[PDB]
Design a protein around this ligand. Sequence first.
Ligand SMILES: COc1cc(N2CCC(O)CC2)ccc1Nc1ncc2c(n1)N(C1CCCC1)CCC(=O)N2C
Ligand SMILES: COc1cc(N2CCC(O)CC2)ccc1Nc1ncc2c(n1)N(C1CCCC1)CCC(=O)N2C
Ligand SMILES: COc1cc(N2CCC(O)CC2)ccc1Nc1ncc2c(n1)N(C1CCCC1)CCC(=O)N2C
Ligand SMILES: COc1cc(N2CCC(O)CC2)ccc1Nc1ncc2c(n1)N(C1CCCC1)CCC(=O)N2C
Ligand SMILES: [Mg+2]
Ligand SMILES: [Mg+2]
Ligand SMILES: [Mg+2]
Ligand SMILES: [Mg+2]
Ligand SMILES: [Mg+2]
Ligand SMILES: [Mg+2]
Lengths: 263, 263, 263, 263
Amino acid sequence: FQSMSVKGRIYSILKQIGSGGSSKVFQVLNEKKQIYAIKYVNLEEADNQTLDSYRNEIAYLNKLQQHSDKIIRLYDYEITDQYIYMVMECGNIDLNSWLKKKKSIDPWERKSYWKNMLEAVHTIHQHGIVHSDLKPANFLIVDGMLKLIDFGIANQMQPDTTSGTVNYMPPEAIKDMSKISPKSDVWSLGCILYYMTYGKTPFQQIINQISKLHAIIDPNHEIEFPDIPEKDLQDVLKCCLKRDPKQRISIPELLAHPYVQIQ
Amino acid sequence: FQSMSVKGRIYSILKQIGSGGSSKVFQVLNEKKQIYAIKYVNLEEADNQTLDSYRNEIAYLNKLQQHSDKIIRLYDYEITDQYIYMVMECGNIDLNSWLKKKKSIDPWERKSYWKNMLEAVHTIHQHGIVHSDLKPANFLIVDGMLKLIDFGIANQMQPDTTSGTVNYMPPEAIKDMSKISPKSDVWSLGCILYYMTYGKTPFQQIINQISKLHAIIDPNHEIEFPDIPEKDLQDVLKCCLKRDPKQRISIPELLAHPYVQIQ
Amino acid sequence: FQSMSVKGRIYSILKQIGSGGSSKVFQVLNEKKQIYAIKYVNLEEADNQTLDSYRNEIAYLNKLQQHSDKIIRLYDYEITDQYIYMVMECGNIDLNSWLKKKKSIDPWERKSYWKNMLEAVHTIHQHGIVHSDLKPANFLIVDGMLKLIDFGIANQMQPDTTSGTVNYMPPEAIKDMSKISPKSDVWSLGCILYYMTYGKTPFQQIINQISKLHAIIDPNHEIEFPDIPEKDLQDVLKCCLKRDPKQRISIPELLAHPYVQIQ
Amino acid sequence: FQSMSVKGRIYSILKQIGSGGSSKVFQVLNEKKQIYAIKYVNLEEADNQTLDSYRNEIAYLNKLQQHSDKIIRLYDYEITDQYIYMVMECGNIDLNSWLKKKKSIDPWERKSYWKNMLEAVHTIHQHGIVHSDLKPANFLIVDGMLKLIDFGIANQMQPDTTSGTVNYMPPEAIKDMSKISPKSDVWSLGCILYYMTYGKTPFQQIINQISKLHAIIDPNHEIEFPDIPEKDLQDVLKCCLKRDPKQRISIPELLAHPYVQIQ
Ligand SMILES: COc1cc(N2CCC(O)CC2)ccc1Nc1ncc2c(n1)N(C1CCCC1)CCC(=O)N2C
Ligand SMILES: COc1cc(N2CCC(O)CC2)ccc1Nc1ncc2c(n1)N(C1CCCC1)CCC(=O)N2C
Ligand SMILES: COc1cc(N2CCC(O)CC2)ccc1Nc1ncc2c(n1)N(C1CCCC1)CCC(=O)N2C
Ligand SMILES: COc1cc(N2CCC(O)CC2)ccc1Nc1ncc2c(n1)N(C1CCCC1)CCC(=O)N2C
Ligand SMILES: [Mg+2]
Ligand SMILES: [Mg+2]
Ligand SMILES: [Mg+2]
Ligand SMILES: [Mg+2]
Ligand SMILES: [Mg+2]
Ligand SMILES: [Mg+2]
């Protein structure tokens, strides 16, 4: 029912898609009645560290545009001491919501989504970012292609309604409680691909968390990998989910793997 | 994830908004990435009477375009023995969904929505249609303005989900079981406006239906009309909900009423 | 968490099962930790007609105890100008809730439930009651046996939650808008048995109500009765759903029918 | 609709309350129509370690009966190579479900529930059990009194429906990834009491888990303790939530605290 001004241009709000604190995301239309998203952050209560965090993202989000189209596009922004408005691409649905809704995944679409994920994470790695907390919520399906989103410092973004959070955590990040590396995202991505392969994360079955945390770090807990028709798929998952990050496969390695390279 | 061709032009589907049988409505985008709706009817099982019913609507929907913008616009259609595709305006939400979600209504917005409703129903009346079953579901909020929708013969359209039906029935339509007239829509509209005024339909409190049906036809059941700041509002409702259709106010009368004419 | 006194005896409340206005039903335990229900009516606002209605039920409920155990038992009650408390049998679930939850019904259980329904309705008929609004909500599953409940004048009882209403209406009751007879309950019961047979009421498919009301009274709307293994079942339904109440089967007839009498 | 035999005595099932794998809990009635619970474990797939785990619980559950009535009572059991059936007390609701439903808690009821929790945990401690994973789900409200439940080795018990998991984890248990002690339950209990005091767990606000795990172990993350009318309450919480288990208050200490000892 409402509207907003970013850098002179007027946008009419269709619906609130999601929110965190003090952030909200809207699906909007521009003067040409074209579909975009606008992220709104209320700064009225933000401390220095947090201000800096939102500045860093906008900056990286700007820089990364040029180097890959598998990062959500930012078109324009207004930023004051009171508020941020960022005009952005609007996808169809996030990967997490989508995975929960899905009967099953077509091997072609899985492989294709895998390529997009690799490219995105490979990209942030080349620019010195190591996410360390990747999850399905960090990907947006836009025109059949996944793009990285919500990849910044403190990003508790969740869909809204009109009425796992640890299954992806890499082992080295647990033990560490100087020891988080690019390899940690490989774990997390592997967990997502495992999900897309077996309909479940490697420890979705363990519902107590002390017990689940234990299982992730424990090498005498053999993870299961039932045989499937795609042997390459099977080897990628096996290499992604090696607990010793040093023996875990790298992103540049994964991009040379037959699973992604051979038709 | 999908797409469709109507009269040469390609449309990509965002989401299914609603359905009946064998109809479905989609929110789609055109080649210029602009937002529209497409109604799809599957004819594979339609009998003559039903075929005729869908033809009548498309025809009326076409004719009524020229005479009022408070009827949903049809832009183009493809019709075969197998299917109908109609490209149409896409509103924000239907009135029924909206009323259920709403805290309360701003008197200005109520009055404005009332004007739109009158104009729409007045329009169909001038073209020999007498709906006889009007309800909140028959109105679509498009850019702050209500437009008549789903007003055709057999139209069981309902919103879809990702997981009253008699409060509006006019008394003469009950007794009749040669006796349905324009006045019957005045009743129904009054019931909607009563809802928008008092947060409830005149017999929402009576949940048994034999009992509710009885109450609608019974003149010794005084309907309540608590005093409000808007006396004109109070008189319109009182005149709309007179049980004797002959003593009920007409649409051309209602358009001259101070409630709609005086600021 | 609470407790209550009826005629000297103390009852502790387990949970609220359901409510209307100004009535509520509780699942309670007695001093011997045995399971009962207590219906509570708040009289603080009851008019004479309504007072009388609640008195009539308690009276009939008392009288009918002696003549059939397919009417819910009342054990004791306290009644003042302020409140009624009735201590009653507590069943497992009502028939309506149960039907909505059910995969499918075992022919033996259907037939058995049919016998109980007939006996109950036959009973009220012998005592000059003609319900005229029977529905699945009017039956309570208690130890594998249906018992009639909520059969009194103004009884808008509905289950509570921790977070059709016209499919059963007999045709003569519609036309009548001196003409309601025992036969009307036969219709309604038939509709319930039809539901238990075909998974659906005879006009569950017609969702518009003007249209559904029309269909119930219209003799050129042939109701469907797909062949099933139980031909007796098929004939009972056909005889219950005859629109001319005079040509409709009677309860004493139905009790002599092979469906209920032959193993 | 069904029934079961434990040690000769027949029990009729009212409803399934909850389940895990391969366990289920039922609300049942005995031959005297009195209300009990029955826990059913299907052993058809249990490995030695798990068999042993279920044996240990039944044994402890038996022994602890004699020493405190704030542990759920076991009355009788049948145990074979195929199944376990345990007849048990049936409470009203578990603490977790109850806390989620609650407007707010009466200080008297909070204190009383606190006493019960202390007594229960104190009891298991005297018998060499150190739970190490206490949570609201581990307590059952039975006749206004909390009793410890589901306190055994692998107990993933969850309520069923007819349609946090880490907020309680003690810091020493995180760092430990020879170092879990009685003090760890004091943490967890404190977190529950904090919840009952402030409507929220100390880190319910941090929704990312890497971040929440970090916060629990981090001493430069001052936990908040807004002043309340009950200063004793304030000191208990402060003493329970000290991160250095050595400087954390003990159960025998907590039982001498003015909060529990002075009216
Ligand atoms: C209609 O567009 C969307 C719909 C949905 N959902 C439909 C409802 C269902 O329950 C699942 C979520 C989810 C995502 C989108 N598209 C979308 N575009 C851009 C962003 C964004 N999300 N989000 C969503 C906010 C919550 C999750 C993703 C955050 C990333 C971002 O910066 N932007 C701009
Ligand atoms: C995003 O667009 C809409 C969203 C909603 N809802 C959001 C979900 C919520 O639960 C309530 C319903 C409801 C209506 C629209 N817009 C809309 N435009 C055109 C038509 C149409 N509806 N519908 C909807 C189908 C179900 C009710 C109206 C039928 C009328 C029609 O011919 N067309 C083309
Ligand atoms: C646990 O006992 C019950 C549970 C349920 N439900 C479980 C919840 C689910 O969503 C469906 C309803 C439904 C009925 C019962 N048992 C029951 N006994 C006696 C009466 C009674 N109902 N009710 C229920 C109140 C709402 C419907 C029936 C009214 C009839 C009556 O006078 N009494 C005393
Ligand atoms: C009617 O009795 C109950 C109802 C509920 N709920 C009502 C539904 C609502 O959504 C929340 C849960 C919860 C607990 C009980 N009573 C109850 N007694 C004994 C055990 C037990 N639970 N449970 C429940 C199973 C799931 C949580 C507790 C496990 C502990 C145990 O060994 N026994 C025997
Ligand atoms: Mg949702
Ligand atoms: Mg929903
Ligand atoms: Mg919805
Ligand atoms: Mg329910
Ligand atoms: Mg529940
Ligand atoms: Mg529920």
